[PDB]
Design a protein around this ligand. Structure first.
Ligand SMILES: [Zn+2]
Ligand SMILES: [Zn+2]
Lengths: 54, 235
């Protein structure tokens, strides 16, 4: 378990979340995107399952 | 079934380094050709090269291998999934191609994009320029490349993702656009067409060096009582 940069912020995610498309982002950042009902990977725009929870 | 393909494939099967699962791939190639299947799946087989492909396939699933180049692409292909390889280039793309995912590779330049392409995902590559965008494109993903500019957008484009590039100016956005992921580029202003996207569209411009004059202009319009444009995220 090493350093995993957020795809967007290059910041070691405090709670890295790996989406099904194998792209990692910070938990907070994902929650912020999902709060606007954008249930997608922000990096590759692959949609996520319904009611998806990180 | 065809004897010439079998001879090529049996020689290819014998020519792999120990980590490559060429016997599984050889059996899948035979069954694909014998039954004239629409899809060939050679994903997750640790393959370093591919041999001549069965000519009738419409879907090529080869993600998560160790490929550095691809063989000639058969001319019926509509979908190619080649993400998570080590690709340095792509061969000429079939005119039938509609969906291409070549993200998470090492591609520096793309070939001509064919007329019927609808979905392009090339995130996490080494692209320093993009080819011109074809008319029916609906999705463009180029996040995590080395782009200084982006070509004009066609008028059915719905999703755009270009975060973490070096783009200095964004072309005017078509009204078809419902999702624009624009973070961490070098933009200092936004095209006025961004304010004309649908009220339910999503735009994220966080991490760009937007000027004071741009910010005052955007704050005035987006916080006005009669604003019906998209929601724009600055953070
Ligand atoms: Zn993050
Ligand atoms: Zn993704």
């Amino acid at each position: 378990f090493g350093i995993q940069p957020c795809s967007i912020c290059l910041g070691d995610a405090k709670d890295p979340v790996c989406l099904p498309c194998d792209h990692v982002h910070c938990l907070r950042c994902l929650r912020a995107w999902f709060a606007s009902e954008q249930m997608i990977c922000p990096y590759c725009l692959t949609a996520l399952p319904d009611e998806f929870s990180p | 079934m065809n004897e010439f393909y079998l001879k090529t494939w049996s020689e290819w099967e014998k020519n792999g380094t120990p980590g490559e699962q060429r016997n599984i791939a050889f059996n899948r190639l035979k069954i694909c050709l014998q039954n004239q299947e629409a899809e060939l799946n050679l994903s997750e087989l640790d393959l370093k090269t591919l041999p001549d492909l069965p000519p009738q396939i419409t879907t090529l699933e080869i993600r998560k291998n160790l490929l550095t180049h691809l063989p000639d692409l058969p001319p019926m292909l509509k979908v190619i999934h080649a993400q998570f390889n080590q690709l340095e280039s792509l061969p000429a793309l079939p005119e039938t191609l509609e969906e291409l995912n070549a993200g998470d590779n090492k591609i520096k330049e793309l070939p001509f994009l064919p007329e019927n392409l609808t979905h392009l995902r090339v995130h996490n590559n080494r692209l320093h320029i993009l080819p011109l965008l074809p008319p029916e494109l609906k999705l463009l993903v180029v996040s995590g490349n080395r782009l200084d500019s982006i070509p004009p957008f066609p008028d059915k484009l719905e999703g755009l993702a270009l975060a973490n590039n070096f783009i200095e100016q964004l072309p005017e956005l078509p009204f078809s656009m419902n999702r624009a992921v624009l973070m961490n580029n070098n933009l200092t202003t936004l095209p006025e067409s961004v304010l004309r996207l649908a009220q339910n569209a999503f735009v994220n411009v966080a991490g760009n060096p937007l000027s004071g004059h741009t910010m005052r202009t955007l704050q005035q319009i987006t916080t006005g009582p009669d604003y019906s444009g998209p929601r724009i995220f600055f953070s």
